[PDB]
């Protein structure tokens, strides 16, 4: 790999559900590259299907110099308009930070995210109560578990 | 607009296909250090009568800005044709505006007329009804930016 991610920090954590995500990313670029890097943040709403994935934002970054590079990827919050009930945002969800080069993903960093609403204790509620509770999104906070990334790397062709 | 001054603007790829991304090579000088990024934007202006048909093509954040001469290439996506009442709206003269802002305050705008023609059609020999109804193959539409006659507007802003 020409590109190795050295560090990912979530700048604003915990945060309101609706606050934009800010990921400060440091990486090394080991050789010259013709094209931009394409970074993406994906909200993963359900553990069982991809049906509730949302691509939050996609950022093209370049041209890329040799050596250390550091930037902030600020991404939109998730859209709540399409959910069967708002309580689907609560409890553990997932966020995936990925980078691709010339449309081929080469790294993915996944995080679990805790989500809680002021005034509610989800551990004390049965499933029907969670489904039906009135959610005030302005009282919902996320907490990204950012010290435990799942990191996956895929070999790609680069400029070869 | 004292801290940043645009020195040169070149269109790299001209004429080009309507669907080809725009490439603007821009040289400027930065006379003093700046806290924040410059925000560049390209705007497609589809109607000369109203702003309903404006499309922001892309917005590029660049920084940090070193003192002195800076040069970069602003690549922007082409216009979207999905929302037009008819495809021939892309033909004839339209406008593109290159602009830069600092901390959400626009300080310069560089505007260009753009000629647009389709292979096989002579618009000067067509009446208005013909132009409205002709089948446009976007793949055969070329734009030609009139890059020697920029309209340049400068707006005093506060900087830091």
């Amino acid at each position: 790999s020409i590109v190795n991610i050295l560090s990912v920090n979530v700048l604003n954590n915990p945060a309101k559900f609706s606050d934009p995500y800010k990921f400060e990313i440091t990486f090394e670029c080991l050789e010259p590259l013709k094209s931009d890097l394409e970074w993406k943040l994906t909200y993963v709403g359900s553990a069982t299907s991809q049906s509730y994935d949302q691509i939050l934002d996609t950022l093209l970054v370049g041209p890329i110099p040799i050596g250390i590079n550091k930037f902030v990827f600020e991404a939109d919050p998730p859209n709540i308009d399409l959910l069967p009930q708002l309580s689907d945002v609560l409890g553990v969800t997932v966020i995936l930070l990925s980078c691709a080069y010339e449309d081929n993903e080469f790294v993915r960093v996944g995080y679990y995210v805790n989500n809680e609403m002021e005034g509610l204790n989800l551990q004390e509620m049965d499933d029907a109560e969670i489904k039906k509770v009135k959610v005030d999104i302005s009282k919902v906070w996320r907490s990204i578990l950012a010290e435990k990334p799942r990191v996956t790397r895929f070999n790609i062709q680069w400029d070869n | 607009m004292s801290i940043v001054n645009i020195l040169s603007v070149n269109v790299l790829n001209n004429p080009a296909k309507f669907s080809d991304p725009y490439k603007f090579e821009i040289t400027f000088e930065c006379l003093e250090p700046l806290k924040s990024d410059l925000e560049w934007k390209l705007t497609y202006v589809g109607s000369a009568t109203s702003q309903s048909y404006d499309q922001i093509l892309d917005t590029l954040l660049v920084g940090p800005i070193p003192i002195g001469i800076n040069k970069f290439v602003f690549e922007a996506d082409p216009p979207n044709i999905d929302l037009l009442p008819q495809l021939s709206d892309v033909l004839g003269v339209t406008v593109i505006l290159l602009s830069c802002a600092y901390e959400d305050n626009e300080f310069v705008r560089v505007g260009y007329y753009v000629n647009n023609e389709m292979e096989g059609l002579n618009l000067q020999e067509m009446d208005d009804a013909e132009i409205k109804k002709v089948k446009v193959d976007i793949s055969k539409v070329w734009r030609s930016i009139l890059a020697e006659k920029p309209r340049v507007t400068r707006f005093n802003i506060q900087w830091d």
Partner: peptide, 6 residues
């Protein structure tokens, strides 16, 4: 470093 959102 130049950053463009899609």
């Amino acid at each position: 470093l130049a950053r463009r959102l899609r």
